[PDB]
Amino acid sequence: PYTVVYFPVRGRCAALRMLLADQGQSWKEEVVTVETWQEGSLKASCLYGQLPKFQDGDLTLYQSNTILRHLGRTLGLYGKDQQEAALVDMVNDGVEDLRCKYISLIYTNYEAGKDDYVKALPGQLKPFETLLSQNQGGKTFIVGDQISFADYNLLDLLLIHEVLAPGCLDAFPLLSAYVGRLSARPKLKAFLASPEYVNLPINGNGKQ
Amino acid sequence: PYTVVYFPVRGRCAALRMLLADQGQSWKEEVVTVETWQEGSLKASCLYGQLPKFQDGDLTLYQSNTILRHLGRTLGLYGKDQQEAALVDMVNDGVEDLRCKYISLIYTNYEAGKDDYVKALPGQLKPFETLLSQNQGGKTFIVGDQISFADYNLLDLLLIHEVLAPGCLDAFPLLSAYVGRLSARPKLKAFLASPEYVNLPINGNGKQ
Ligand SMILES: N[C@@H](CCC(=O)N[C@@H](CSc1ccc([N+](=O)[O-])cc1[N+](=O)[O-])C(=O)NCC(=O)O)C(=O)O
C-alpha cells in the first residue's frame, strides 16, 4: 500500500494527499516528531536527509515531486499523450518555482519580505490563468480534459496563497472558478474539510 | 525538429544539449542577446517570462526539466518501467535541488558564500555516490542499466562543480569514474570538446 512519512504539517505533502484522497486511494500516515527527527537515525537513512519519504509496496521514494509524478504515472493522471505529459510537467515545474519562493518567504524573510512578495504575486499567478484560458476556456483542468498531478499541486499552491494574501485570485476569474470547481469534487471536498487537513499547520514554523 | 532558445551560456541548457548530442539528434540554436531580451517582447511571450524556450515541431515548451523529461520520454531515456522512471525522477529532483543552491551562490553571493558552499559540498554529493554504489557497483548509470535524462543532468552538475571546487570528486570514487566514463561516450566526447560548448560561459555573470 501507500505510506507517507512526514512531519505534522501540510507543506510538501498537501498536494499528494489531496491526490490520493480524490482518487479514492487509501494510505497510511507516519508522523515524525521533531524529537524523533532530532534523534538523527531517520534523517541519516533518508536519501537526501529530508522528508517526505514515501512507500508504495517495497518501493521507497523521496522528493515531493517524484511522489506526485509516480502517483500521476501509475494512476493515469499524467496527460493522454506525450504532448500533454510535457505540458503537465511544464505546469508542475512552474508550480514548484513559485512554491520555492513561497517557502523562502515563510522560513526566511516573512516579516520584511511579505509586502514585496504580495506585490509581485499577480505576475507570478498570471501564467496559470493564461494556461487555463488556452484550455477550453479554463472550464476543465490545467492541461487537457482529464485531471493530472499538476492540478493537485497547483490547487494547493493557490489555496495557501489565498491564506497568505486573501483575495489574490479576485482578479483571476479562471483561477478562482478552478479552485472552487476542484475543491468541490466530492472526495476532495470531504478531505479538505476533514480534521487531518484542517487541524494541521500549513508550514512547520507557524507562519502562513 | 528541435530548437533551443537561450542566452549565450551553458547554464540550464547544458544537460539537454549533451543529451541531444549524445543521442545523435539534430537541433537548432536560437541565441538571445541581452539587448533582444531587454527589448521585452520575447520575454513577455514566454510563459514564465524566462528562458530556455524549446520547440519540438509546433510544441513549445518552457522549464529546463520539462524539456529534459520530454526528451527522455520521447527518446526512451526514462527508465525501463514505471519503477525505474520514479527513481530517475528522484535523481533529477535531487540534481535540481543542488543546482538551485549552486545558482544561488553564483548569482547571489559568490564572494562571501563560496567557502561555506564548498565545505558543505561533500554532504551534497554523497547521495549520488550512494545511488551509484547501489546500482551494479556504480559501473553503469545512475538508474538501471540504460542511460536516462537524469544522467545528463547529473553529469553537468558534477562537471560544473569540479570547475567550482577542483577535486571535489576525489572524495567520491564512483562519481569520479562515472564522470570519466560518460564523458568518454564518443558523440558526447566530441560535443564537450567542440567550440559550440567550449566557447560558451557556464553562467551568465561570468562566475564559475
Ligand atoms: N526537494 C524536497 C524538499 C524536502 C524538504 O524541504 N524537507 C524539509 C521539510 S521542512 C523545511 C523545508 C524548507 C525550508 N526552507 O527554509 O526552505 C525550511 C524547512 N524547515 O523545517 O524549516 C526537511 O525535511 N527538513 C529536515 C531536515 O533537512 O533535516 C522535496 O520536494 O520533497
Ligand SMILES: N[C@@H](CCC(=O)N[C@@H](CSc1ccc([N+](=O)[O-])cc1[N+](=O)[O-])C(=O)NCC(=O)O)C(=O)O
Ligand atoms: N525554472 C526555470 C528557470 C529559468 C531561469 O532561471 N531563467 C533565467 C536564466 S538567468 C538567471 C537565473 C537565475 C538567477 N538567480 O539569481 O537565481 C539569475 C539569473 N540572471 O540572469 O542573473 C532567465 O531567463 N532570466 C531572465 C529573466 O528573468 O528576465 C528553468 O528550469 O528553466
